[PDB]
């Protein structure tokens, strides 16, 4: 139980990678508050995976596009569990579209969720975080390698976290809070399954030859959130099966 | 004991970070052979083997790997932790010091990696110990040292491609001191814990990466 007595906030905790993060932090002893945008049923199943196993949890409905909601969610978490130790920023939106074709609404929604809300959550959490804390953003390997058309805005939204992480590491380093940017490759989820021709084409670009697993992303996040990782800060850390080699 | 039954080779395992890596991998259950700088020492019924070998000597390194495999079978893990740091300006650095940094920091990393790869189980792990000076060189005097460490970035990428069909991962751990965002130097045990994580069964999807553990020196 390396996270015994710690409090974690996960932005986007109800499915895929986020659900795996919430469960793994809880299994290591953390109390976890998480946000979900869409489904109360799904957030219930996540909340039950934590509690049936003995862990403590709070599920908060919050739209990562609304400033006010994330700020509110952070405060509600703090009321419930006390000051934060760990923040994991896992909201994410993907729309494909060429430079000449992408709709401005889609651009706006990727900026709101993938960029703006990462900062806003980070700011509120930092205001309510213990010294010695951990802030982990979930970015993408597309910040480093964009091998196909249609991902310009997505990749922009993710390479944004590189500079955010560096400057936040400077800001919060005097409080011994680390800040890191986890950059996954393709991961097998319901909306991006390891199946079909698209998947095959992505696997071909990867050194390993399979999609990553939610639990593997979770493992790394939990290592970074833990007591051995206090010297890792400012870093963009790829976990992408060699996609970006 | 997530490394129970696994075998590790650590090039440069006798003090500081190397010693911490040896100790951590052994504590997780691995058999560990390491080099330090033919002569070897071990304990009856123990699973740690210390082998005297200069990292500039190609035959001694190849032999050391082969000795490890004789004791313990195919490797699962290699950690390349040898390293020399000589300061000198571009105009002044002695060519023998250039040669020593290339031999130890660069050439012996490939030599050990090649020999390990020939005797390594699929599903294995290769971890190079590089430096954050590959990304940020804030003062004069470190050009050859920085060069020797940024070399490991292209090596890591290309070896990851070579070995990925055998599910062997290859990564480059980049420490900073053991300019700082966090206000302290790193502890050898911290570097070791990151190596141990990458060496273990949860890290099979991490490959080709240069992973900084530097207190934000390079931010």
Numbering used by the authors:
A (entry chain A): 5 to 249
B (entry chain B): 5 to 41, 51 to 191, 209 to 249
Article sentences:
We have previously identified an SDR from Serratia marcescens BCRC 10948 (SmSDR) that was able to convert 1-(3-hydroxyphenyl)-2-(methylamino) ethanone (HPMAE) into (R)-PE. SmSDR is a 3-oxoacyl-acyl-carrier-protein (OACP) reductase of the classical SDR subfamily that catalyzes the reduction of its authentic substrate, OACP, to (3 R)-3-hydroxy-ACP, participating in the fourth step of 16-carbon palmate biosynthesis. Each subunit is intertwined to form an α/β/α-fold barrel, of which the seven-β-stranded central sheet is flanked by six α-helices on either side, showing a nucleotide-binding Rossmann scaffold. Two phenylalanines, Phe98 from the β4–α4 loop (residues 94–107) and Phe202 from the α7 helix, face toward each other, thus constituting a bridge structure over the top of the binding pocket.
Given an atomic resolution diffraction of apo-form (1.47 Å), the structure of the mutant F98AF202L was determined to 1.87 Å, showing a clear electron density map of F98A and F202L. A close-up view of the region between residues 98 and 202 showed that there is significant conformational alteration: (1) no contacts between residues 98 and 202 in F98AF202L [Cβ(Ala98)–Cδ1(Leu202): 9.81 Å; Cβ(Ala98)−Cδ2(Leu202): 11.39 Å] and in F98LF202L [Cδ1(Leu98)–Cδ2(Leu202): 9.20 Å and Cδ2(Leu98)–Cδ1(Leu202): 9.33 Å]; and (2) an additional H bond between the hydroxyl groups of Y98 and Y202 in F98YF202Y [hydroxyl O(Tyr98)–O(Tyr202): 3.10 Å]. Thus, the replacement of the bulky aromatic chain with a shorter side chain at the region of residue 98 greatly led to the loss of the hydrophobic contacts between two arms. Structural comparison of the mutant structures (F98AF202L, F98LF202L, and F98YF202Y) demonstrated an overall homologous fold. Structural comparison indicated relatively low RMSD values among these structures [apo vs. F98AF202L: 0.11 Å (223 Cα atoms); apo vs. F98YF202Y: 0.14 Å (234 Cα atoms); and apo vs. F98LF202L·NADPH: 0.14 Å (226 Cα atoms)].
